[PDB]
RNA sequence: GCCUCUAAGCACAACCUGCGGGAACCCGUACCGCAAACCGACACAGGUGGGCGGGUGCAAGAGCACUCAGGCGCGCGGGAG
RNA sequence: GCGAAUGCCGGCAUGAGUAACGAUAAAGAGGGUGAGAAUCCCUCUCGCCGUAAGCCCAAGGGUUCCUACGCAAUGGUCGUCAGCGUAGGGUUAGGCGGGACCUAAGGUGAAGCCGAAAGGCGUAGCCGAAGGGCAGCCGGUUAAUAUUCCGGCCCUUCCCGC
RNA sequence: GAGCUGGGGCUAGGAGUGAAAAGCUAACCGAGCCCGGAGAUAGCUGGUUCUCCCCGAAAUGACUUUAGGGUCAGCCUCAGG
RNA sequence: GAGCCGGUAGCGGGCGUGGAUCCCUGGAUGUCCGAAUGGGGGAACCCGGCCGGCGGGAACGCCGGUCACCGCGCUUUUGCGCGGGGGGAACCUGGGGAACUGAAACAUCUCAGUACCCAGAGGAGAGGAAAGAGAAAUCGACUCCCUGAGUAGCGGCGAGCGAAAGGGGACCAGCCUAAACCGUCCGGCUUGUCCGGGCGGGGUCGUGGGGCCCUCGGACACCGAAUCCCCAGCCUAGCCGAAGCUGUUGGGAAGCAGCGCCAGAGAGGGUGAAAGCCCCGUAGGCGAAAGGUGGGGGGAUAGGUGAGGGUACCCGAGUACCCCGUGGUUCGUGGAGCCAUGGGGGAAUCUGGGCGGACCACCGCCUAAGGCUAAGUACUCCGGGUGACCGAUAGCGCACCAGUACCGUGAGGGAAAGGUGAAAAGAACCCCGGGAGGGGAGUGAAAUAGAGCCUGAAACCGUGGGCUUACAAGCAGUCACGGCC
């Protein structure tokens, strides 16, 4: 893999799709869509010391930057 | 008839078979018990050449081998060996002994 | 020849390395001879070669627990 | 291991007339560097290892009799004397 | 390969050059090989890359006809017809 | 516990001793060897190639090539002939070629970008060509192979010295 | 000449290429080939085995994306009554 | 225990009761390829750098020790010293993840989270000490079996798919870490008092840890290999080891006859035809070792567990929780909760906070957003044993020089052939012949048992004998009759 998280994993699976409403307001379900697909994130970067990069994801990520920012 | 024998090149007698007169086990075996009694063969009537004399015809025709043989003897013929008993240090001696006995040992007969 | 593993025991370093080289070379010789002798030869091969390893299976012995 | 015997003579007539003339043929460990025979040939046959050449032959048919096979693998190689001298008995014996 | 400077050593034993002396291993070749040995399940008249393709004759020339060397006479025969 | 499924496997007949022997480039004679030779060997007539059925290099084949025997099998028959069977023996090069050197397309791939994983992509360096480059040729000798063996002639690079 | 051609490589079978008829893609690719889901489905046909003894069918009803198929009904066979 | 140079005889040669062949355990180099790793490379082959050596020294050439790559920890210094990786019939976890066919169509649905590609751990992984269950006031880790219902239920509610607590059974340890509180510390920035990094006390288990006061307290608990010592269990070799001879037809004999024998061992095979005492080192019981695996039983090694009330609180993980997109769940969309995450929001210290009745008011339940292995079910490469399991066209295709022949470009495909004889005694020599092969002679119990040579039947082809046949149209046959023999 190279394409995670940093922050832990994120690069990950899913299936979906759908049909039509009308439900509990006049009608049953209404459905069709067996599909699947993807799912994610962002990218980043700052400074170890006058020289760096970041990577990461997202919001773990602002966390993060914060945290190792501490040192 | 296996990696364990009878009777080596030791001597006895046939029961059921040819002969019974028991003789020289010229030699016998490991696994098929195949073994020589200098008694009971043929002459191969063989050869053409000089292989075989100049006029070829193979000579002792023996090759023993059912295992009805009427194996050892003491001063007791028909039998059936034992084990020992020892006695001795490192004392194998596995002679052979029931009824009558008859050890082989190493000296005046094999 | 169990002698043979004897003497064998005996020598060590240099000795054994030149000794069972030199014999090495007589098998040679025997080499050589696949087509004269021959009938009694038989034994100089096979055994020959058993010696000769011998000497091998003992520097290595030696030395061996040497270093 | 390490141990210089290397070689089977060329017992080949062809070869032989050669031999008589001053230089002879044999037949080695398949893979004697060339100057890995001259220094067989020289400190073995206490000889002055002149030329030598490398030619290799594997043995292909010989059937046996329900299934087959060929033979393996023969290597031939010559080398010159010098004056013409050594290989005494091989040569002058035969 | 010729030059062409760093490192840098050289320059004291680096490179160009004469002579003498010493060396220089591995695998490969045989025969078939425009083809009964290579490709078509076969001694299948199919296909397959470059090398002159001898001579005489024809305006010309690897087409033509007889042929030079060299190579064949095609792998079942005879018989009327 | 079985005709029967154009069934399954293995025998076996049937055409049928007609069809067919692989090219319309032809043979014929004489002697010879042999157990037997239209069908092998020598030799004398004659036809077809010849720019090809001729020489050669390379590819691919890989035994076989030769010498001695041998044929029951195999050749679309024959056959004492062979590439057949059996045994032995047969090919070698500082200067032929290939690598001990060079890169092409192109493949690999320290790093780099990359994926849900297995990968994708890829500089550098490398691997990769009868394309680059590199020191000989002719005459002789074996059943056999050679600018490799012999010899005569012209070299080649690297090593120690000087 | 948009030529012909040897050797070296790069693209491939729902994708390749394709001077394009649906062309060719290890000999008959309108969607490669081996193995695998697989013994798919197979109201369609083939076939569906010892002997003897009783009886003896229907080859129509009704609705069915069914209509040379079925579910319920009529005729049959064996058991109780 | 006294023969052996495998399967192979044969040649031509040998070593051994001063334990030879050989059965197991440790060995010893251990050609070249192969994850390959010193470099390259169409594997099983050609390159080279360092130190050692031998050669006519050096340039040539070998034996030699040598010289990837990755992450990993340490001396980051120049880094020296650990680990991986590569496989494996089937079982394992996760990662991604499909049409058929059914629903006599077919789009939700369905085969299924199956086939299938991948990564990876093992010898078994997996799960595994409750923000659990369940509603009575109980249960009490996890895994596997039977029962639980095929009901509760899931849905073009259609084809279908289909629970869980409990109950019964087996198998029964429960332990740990940041949890800043504290101290000490090493580094800090900057100075004072935050954070970072050590060792601790706490190092939560069914919730308390700790800091303050006092009541404390001074010998049993052993590891999920804690660990070590032995009965080590097997691995492969052991050993004994029950009782008959005579006769007899017989190529035979163990049969048929006479008596005589054994049995905590009348399971079997084997010896020229059907033997409890002839063969088997078996069921009878016993056998064992200086090597390679521990559940035992035991010890010791025992890291580390093991109090009482008071008091202002600091104290297990950034994300629960909420919205939308989705997975799992017996739910297919839904009045649909719990766990699981992809997006945006984005906190509480045990008056906390999720979980039972969407959701509200209640009681109850649990204490999560770190980590650890046992043991009871799986699997079958391999060993052993058994079979109203098979006979060589069924059996693994495969009973023995078949995963090989052979077809295919590679992938891949993928046969046939077992049984001469009691034992070789298996064919001297003579006779036709180029041979083959055929006639004799000897084998012999048979050879119409003769080298594919057991038993060897059907098809079809042959040689001989009876009847039969040329004015005749019939699948067949067949009822009668006469002529033949």
Known sequence: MKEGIHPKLV???IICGCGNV????????EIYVEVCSKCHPFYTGQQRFVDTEGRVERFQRRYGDSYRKGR | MRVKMHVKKGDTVLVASGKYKGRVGKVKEVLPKKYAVIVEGVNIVKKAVRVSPKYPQGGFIEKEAPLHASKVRPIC??????????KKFLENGKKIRVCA?????LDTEE | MRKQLEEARKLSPVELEKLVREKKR??????????????????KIRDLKRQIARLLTVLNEKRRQNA | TAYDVILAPVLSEKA???????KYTFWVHPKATKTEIKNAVE??????????????????????????????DRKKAIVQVAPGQKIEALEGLI
């Open chain 4, 43 to 72: 400190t073995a046959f206490k000889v002055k290892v002149v030329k030598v050449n490398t030619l290799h032959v594997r043995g292909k048919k010989k059937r046996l009799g329900r299934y087959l096979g060929k033979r393996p």
């Open chain 1, 11 to 13: 690069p990950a699976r």
């Open chain 4, 16 to 22: 032989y007339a050669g031999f008589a003339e001053g």
């Open chain 2, 101 to 105: 006995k008859c050890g082989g040992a």
């Open chain 1, 22 to 29: 009308i439900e509990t307001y006049s009608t049953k379900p």
């Open chain 2, 77 to 86: 013929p028909a039998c059936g060996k034992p084990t020992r008993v020892r």
């Open chain 3, 26 to 43: 007589e098998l040679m010789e025997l080499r050589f001879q696949a087509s004269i002798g021959q009938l009694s030869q038989n034994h």
